[PDB]
Design a protein around this ligand. Structure first.
Ligand SMILES: Cc1ncccc1N[C@@H](C)c1ccc2c(c1)OCCO2
Length: 116
């Protein structure tokens, strides 16, 4: 509270580290369904069904332009990506498997980088 501050993380590296994790996401071979915005004019259903579309390139743009206040907001966009994927895609499909694979790959790096 007021004048009762928790000692907390050095956040000076966070921006760099997020960018590197993202770079590793972007370079993963199963990254392809997520690199670019889903085309709302070519995929029927997506716009109506998916209320907050998200993708790596949009995450990269927000990161590089200071639109993430902190770590948790960055991770929220990343998870949003794979939550949208689960919503629209059968688990038993190429894109569906990509999402599960990419999510697991992210959470691993998220924990190894920040969570001690
Ligand atoms: C993540 C996701 N969920 C639902 C629909 C699409 C997508 N990804 C787009 C880029 C996409 C991924 C794969 C494609 C494609 C578009 O257009 C046709 C060929 O295969």
């Amino acid at each position: 509270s007021m004048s009762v501050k928790k000692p907390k993380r050095d956040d000076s590296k966070d921006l760099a580290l997020c960018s590197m994790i993202l770079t590793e996401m972007e370079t993963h071979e199963d990254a392809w369904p997520f690199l670019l915005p889903v085309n709302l004019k070519l995929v029927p259903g997506y716009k109506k069904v998916i209320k907050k579309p998200m993708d790596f390139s949009t995450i990269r743009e927000k990161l590089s332009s200071g639109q993430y206040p902190n770590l948790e907001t960055f991770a929220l966009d990343v998870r949003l990506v794979f939550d949208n994927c689960e919503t629209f895609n059968e688990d038993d499909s190429d894109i569906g498997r990509a999402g599960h694979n990419m999510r697991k790959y992210f959470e691993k790096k998220w924990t190894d980088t920040f969570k001690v």
